[PDB]
Subunit: 176 residues, 3 copies
């Protein structure tokens, strides 16, 4: 049974021993990163024959987010338990940002093709998670690498969103 009922009174476990309330800043940060991941999976499902290229990196992004979630759930002082390192993932994001940035043609408004719009939604959820990650940071020591990655990731989603639009011959929505 996947339901233990240990959570039915509003408390839960993290990595290590601490029992925390579900509204605890750390539980929320791990939660928002998990919601971002759900949305990436949703976005990934909207891929078709014209946008097929975007599929593996999005899938890869989901792996990276799982790792981010793991480290957010891990207290820095914990003696028995951080697996996420930002350098390779972020550089990889930076390559795609520059790639997509030069391919594509005012301020840009979120929208366009359904995949582009979903990638624009990814951008804003990534940012919502980022604020919650900073909020944790202000109370507890966190893996700063997660924050570096998350910050770059919303930039990736802006870049990929524009590219998704470009891939289906769709103009970016512009502020008039």
């Amino acid at each position: 049974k996947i339901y233990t009922k240990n959570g039915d009174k509003g408390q839960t476990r993290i990595i290590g021993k601490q029992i925390l309330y579900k509204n605890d800043p750390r539980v929320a940060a791990y939660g928002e990163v998990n919601e971002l991941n759900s949305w990436v999976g949703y976005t990934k499902s909207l891929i078709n024959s014209h946008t097929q290229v975007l599929s593996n990196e999005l899938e890869e992004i989901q792996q990276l987010l799982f790792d981010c979630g793991h480290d957010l759930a891990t207290p820095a002082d914990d003696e028995r338990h951080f697996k996420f390192k930002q350098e390779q993932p972020t550089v990889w994001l930076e390559e795609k940002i520059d790639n997509y940035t030069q391919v594509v043609p005012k301020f840009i408004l979120p929208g366009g093709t359904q995949l582009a719009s979903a990638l624009h939604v990814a951008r804003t959820i990534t940012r919502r998670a980022e604020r919650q990650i900073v909020q944790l940071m202000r109370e507890e020591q966190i893996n700063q690498d997660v924050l570096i990655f998350i910050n770059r990731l919303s930039d990736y989603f802006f870049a990929a969103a524009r590219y998704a639009n470009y891939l289906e011959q769709q103009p970016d929505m512009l502020y008039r």
Copy 2:
């Protein structure tokens, strides 16, 4: 006219007499449960001929959430106004969890078919609402039955998500 303009200064009514600010913990909990409901409706709209079975329970889940919202909007001390009881709804969820759990084949990453992905998104929004419900709980007496149901509900959505994938011959996305 559906707009009274009574809210234009950031205040609103709940069940009973209290005028509360819209950022009040209770207004937020009622709000997050309402967003969950919107998303279930959205998820329900993605059903097609292969996933048609999932339709009634999702519809049923929306009824239950409306009730949850009602009780969250109701102060426990209020003399003129709780309608939600968890036993039958939660057992009903537990049956479907076990059903779906045995039908379907690493950690699972959210994604797959569009309906499966949406059910995975439902899971995380349910959890976001759950944290906001706990947050209310820590300041005010609430209907604990709502919390019991909500906690089980995200487990339902994990279970149904996997099943949605299974229904369309789609493998669960796995952590590599």
Copy 3:
């Protein structure tokens, strides 16, 4: 390069000089309004030949939200920088609310056609943003016009959602 890396330590700029933490109430309000906008773009992408009429106003709503975001990012005391005025936008919303309100046939549950459901999701995200805008308001002076508009906007989305359902011959989901 769209990534400056100035944000990698959890801090960011607003309109004017203040460097703020990303979890700052003002950064969150600007963020939630930006997420609403993403979702409107997403909703707009779900339009087809039967719902084509809804397209321009949704597009127009995205312009208005960009302005809302701008003013939320602007401290009221700032000497070098408010562009949003609510009167024309809100009256325009009020016309569409009355229009759509008379066209369309219990409490209504969110859901129906995919576009209707998305407009129902828009409603709840608008409201989530509204609570975050009030939260800012309780600490800082804000452009009250933004709040007036946002409040009416979720009413617009309820109205348009029902109409989207009506446009595709779909009954509103009712609380049983």
